[PDB]
Design an enzyme around this catalytic site. Structure first.
Site, PDB file in Angstrom:
ATOM      1  CG  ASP A   1      45.720  46.442 -17.974  1.00  0.00           C
ATOM      2  OD1 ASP A   1      46.689  45.932 -17.336  1.00  0.00           O
ATOM      3  OD2 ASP A   1      44.530  46.467 -17.527  1.00  0.00           O
TER       4      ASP A   1
ATOM      5  CD  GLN B   1      51.720  38.105 -27.984  1.00  0.00           C
ATOM      6  OE1 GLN B   1      51.962  38.742 -26.950  1.00  0.00           O
ATOM      7  NE2 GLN B   1      50.679  37.308 -28.079  1.00  0.00           N
TER       8      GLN B   1
ATOM      9  NE  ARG C   1      52.862  42.865 -21.551  1.00  0.00           N
ATOM     10  CZ  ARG C   1      51.972  43.068 -20.573  1.00  0.00           C
ATOM     11  NH1 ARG C   1      52.276  42.763 -19.313  1.00  0.00           N
ATOM     12  NH2 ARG C   1      50.753  43.498 -20.890  1.00  0.00           N
ATOM     13  CB  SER C   2      58.757  36.685 -23.036  1.00  0.00           C
ATOM     14  OG  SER C   2      58.098  36.478 -21.772  1.00  0.00           O
TER      15      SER C   2
ATOM     16  CB  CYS D   1      54.805  38.066 -20.676  1.00  0.00           C
ATOM     17  SG  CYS D   1      55.067  37.323 -22.337  1.00  0.00           S
TER      18      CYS D   1
END
Ligand SMILES: CCNC(=O)Oc1ccc(-c2csnn2)cc1
Length: 282
Positions: free
Chosen positions: A181, A262, A221-222, A215
């Site tokens: 998370d 990110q 993440r992508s 994601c």
């Protein structure tokens, strides 16, 4: 410069934040006018994450062709990816229309439906074989065929039917279920293992349409998934594997979708993944 030496030099100097801001400063700025039209407000999850006009995927319909999705075309690597947000309650039918129209074989999901106690994407696939899903707005039927649950990922076989023509296709759903998370994985071991199952499957190969990767926003993440895959493929193709510059590949990919990677930890993690990936064939 051999990226592993570059890596140790940034770690010892603790300069990940500085390297990451330099990428943010140099990244492309292209218009996203279609994303910002008032008619498209409920088709965007995040006000600050939009596809560029030049690279956006168009739906094949005269009514409204808009989806929050981008085509990333990597010319030297000879790989293409569609990067998209997690589907919203009113865009699950659009999502599956896009998979159908683009001739994709695979969908790669890097998030859980609930994370941090909030919904990160709609439940957009069926959980039981005998309870299929019908998307009335796009005229598609989706059935769960089989499910294989492993410690770090789940693979699903799905059947998508175009109810207009009664054509059917097999879609493979690759679901990475263990991204934490907060932050990034301590090792890139399972994420790198996950990538090779998607490849293994044929889902990334040129006989199919581009893989669909998501994601929650479809950039973090992508972005790590496509960046690691492209860098590894270039290190296989070229004479000098050390000529592959991860920062230059990331800026090339940012010509096609804003904001890929990110955080400085995701950058560090992306570097870690390629370095540790390049090493496992040795
Ligand atoms: C800790 C790393 N080892 C691991 O768990 O799995 C893999 C599997 C494949 C590759 C690979 C082939 S070509 N580029 N990278 C790297 C790692």
């Amino acid at each position: 410069m051999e990226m592993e030496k570059e890596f140790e030099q940034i770690d010892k100097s603790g300069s990940w934040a500085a390297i990451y801001q330099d990428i943010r400063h140099e990244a492309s700025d292209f218009p996203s006018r279609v994303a910002k039209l008032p008619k498209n407000k409920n088709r965007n999850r995040y006000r600050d994450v939009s596809p560029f006009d030049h690279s956006r995927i168009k739906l094949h319909q005269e009514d409204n062709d808009y989806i929050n999705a981008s085509l990333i075309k990597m010319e030297e690597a000879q790989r293409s990816y569609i990067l998209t947000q997690g589907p919203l309650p009113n865009t699950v039918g659009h999502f599956w229309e896009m998979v159908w129209e683009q001739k994709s074989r695979g969908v790669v999901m890097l998030n859980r439906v609930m994370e941090k106690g909030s919904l990160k994407c709609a439940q957009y696939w069926p959980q039981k074989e005998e309870k299929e899903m019908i998307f009335e707005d796009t005229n598609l039927k989706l059935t769960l065929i089989s499910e294989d649950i492993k410690s770090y990922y789940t693979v699903r076989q799905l059947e998508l039917e175009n109810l207009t023509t009664q054509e059917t296709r097999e879609i493979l759903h690759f679901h990475y279920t263990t991204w934490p998370d907060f932050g990034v994985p301590e090792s890139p071991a399972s994420f790198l293992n996950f990538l090779f199952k998607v490849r293994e499957s044929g889902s990334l190969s040129p006989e199919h349409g581009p893989v669909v990767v998501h994601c929650s926003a479809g950039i973090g993440r992508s972005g790590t998934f496509c960046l690691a895959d492209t860098c590894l493929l270039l290190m296989d193709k070229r004479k000098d594997p050390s000529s592959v510059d991860i920062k230059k590949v990331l800026l090339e990919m940012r010509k096609f979708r804003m904001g890929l990677i990110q955080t400085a930890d995701q950058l560090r993690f992306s570097y870690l993944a390629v370095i540790e990936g390049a090493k496992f064939i040795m």
